[PDB]
């Protein structure tokens, strides 16, 4: 055929509308997941529970994809206790959740029970939450489950502001896992794996290197 | 409707694109009433506001042989870090380039609003909830106590760096709000 | 869908043909009006019939839409005689055309019936040439038709070369109207009123400012 | 609801019910937006205005022993004579009168509504039309050139002179307009 | 920059700013806008530079 | 009908593609003769 005459522009517009393509490009983006949270360990001579900040930097699976968007809000959260311990093992796991950081730490088994979320187990108990990280049935697991309606958008962080007042940090921090032991063993210990399975929506994307 | 509770749909000149010489860095503008002068005037008179829209529009003023672009994005976290690359732009939320001398045809969005082959950013407002209005940034505090006031920064970058600073264009925005309670327009800061 | 990659033009033409659109635009526009010529002035010293030239700028609507074009030619131009005296009242009027600026203005009945478009009548004869002013019925009027047939395009003008050759008036001046009376009041007075029942078509605008 | 024009409901203190002590004649005041600060602040962002409501609560803070009564009523005409009287007050538009002591039960009005057992005056709305918002008024004009902005005047009169002048209560306006046309505050005049 | 000014005791913008904050505010590349030589004709007022006139209860 | 509004290009290509139509300008020309 005829070669085409093309007419040359003093220009031509390059444009790109949205968020470049790609794994994590979504506004939004929906992620389920099971992670390993830290090891139940009991002190021999604290009888104050452990703290576990329940937000995603503190997942490091999570946290590679969470830290390519700016906002998070949770929707499920719940953790899972697994005993690596006989049934000769005396003492039990205690856990709840602490909603305001400005809240103090319970530091025994009457101010646990208090506290939302509350749960306690033999610590030999519930190893069928094994099928719970994978299939399901909770049925004889020993979860700890979050409070997550109501919780709205959260900034996503990769820290912390831990010297600061309590209010600025729950601008960022949903709430916080405790964790006690009913029992000082003669000396310290691992009973069992908390593992969390956590849910939550990802929303507005960014550079992951900006995020912090 | 009503019951301490006033919705509003405003235009106005944010600022002027600047390109530096010597920064690749982006400029960051809050997405506040206090930012926009005629709007705030409007603001002021209320304790909490809402945003619904706020879109910002670029409108060029350039011959068309000017080279680079303009590039927009939104940071929701204060925390985050300013953009000071294309792909850093690129992967953020509301990303949008186009060439700088590109985009009168989005003069239709200011009067009434066709917004096609208009060059606008878009911020994410759905879930945005009520925010105290107010007349300054405690920059100089944790970003967490600023992301209490700014539900975002719009970053605008310049792709490249002309040989001279300079504006090749000019940023409008749309917005569109709730204004909540009251307040003497003095006394609110 | 896509950001459309606009291609930029070194320019692009900014076209107009033809006067921009609006109510006096067309190439040609016909005008159909009545028009208040003026009063049938009766002098009580003089026998000269008084002269009226059949032009557009002597007739204030018809004017202001005439000016917006530079050639008209008169269709039909009819002058009506409207009594507003009793049938007590003696006298007559005569009404005639002259179609050249040249010729002398009539000073008497004879001459005036020499005229062409030559018509008398009782002042106080015509009334019903009221109905003719808005639908018709001139069978009971007193008109005086100018002979429009022939008449070709003439230049719009805002004025008439009066201390001019009568020949270059004529270019500008399909004709005049004459009106007379037959008789001498003791008194100057006003019998009745002279409307023109003018039909002409407008042709080739121009912007009214510039029109003369 | 849309394109240049959005309701406008607020309340704010109008001025202080001063009794003369010598004086008979009724204080005048113009309802447009510009005497109240806070709507000033916010009808200044338009150029047209239209008042839906315009209502003056009287409100009492005296002993329920002073004597005397509040009069109040509107002047649509610049032109019109002030009230010099009781008579002349009762027979114009919105009059209404009230005992000085009397009226804190209309304190709800402010907030909600009932106005049961109110002393309000209520100027005539319904037939108002769009008017320029001002940031003043020709005074020395002819009354109809100031008719053209001014919508009507609330004349307040004491019907006793107390022995030393005195204020026993506060008018407070319970406005609702509507704005149409945006305008730099700061270029409205 | 275009917009318009309903009250002739109003400033007349001497700047951007104070023009967005006018009403009708237009702006456009100064070269932008040839299509609107078809509105003057037929319509398509899609890619034309227009300053509309609030008309809407304007009296007689 | 509307004028139509020319968009002017900085230039335009001016090509030609093989050599030039005519008599000789083929390929091959086979050819026999006394
Ligand atoms: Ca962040
Ligand atoms: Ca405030
Ligand atoms: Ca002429
Ligand atoms: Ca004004």
């Known amino acids: ?34 992670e390993f949270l830290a090891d139940f360990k009991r002190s021999s001579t604290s009888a104050d529970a452990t703290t576990y900040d329940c937000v995603p930097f503190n997942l490091p699976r999570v946290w590679s994809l969470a830290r390519c968007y700016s906002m998070w ?13 006989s049934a000769t093992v005396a003492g039990s796991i205690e856990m709840c959740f602490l909603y305001d950081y400005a809240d103090t730490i319970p530091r025994y ?3 646990m029970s208090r506290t939302a979320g509350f749960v306690t187990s033999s610590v030999w108990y519930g190893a069928e939450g094994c099928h719970l990280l994978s299939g399901g049935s909770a049925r004889n697991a020993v979860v700890a489950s979050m409070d997550c309606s109501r919780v709205g958008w959260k900034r996503v962080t990769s820290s912390i502001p831990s010297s600061v007042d309590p209010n600025v940090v729950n601008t ?9 032991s009913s029992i000082k063993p003669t000396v310290s210990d691992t009973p069992g ?19 912090t």
């Open 172 to 180: 960022i921090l949903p709430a916080r896992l405790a964790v006690r």
């Open 109 to 111: 088994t009457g101010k």
């Open 1 to 34: 055929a005829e070669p085409q005459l093309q007419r040359a522009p003093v220009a031509q517009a390059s444009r790109i509308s949205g968020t470049v393509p790609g794994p994590l490009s979504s506004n939004t983006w929906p992620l389920h997941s099971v």
């Open 73 to 85: 809000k949770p929707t499920r959260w719940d953790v899972v206790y697994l005993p690596e311990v």
């Open 193 to 211: 794996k908390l593992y969390v399975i956590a849910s939550m929506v990802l929303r507005d994307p960014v550079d992951p290197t900006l995020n």
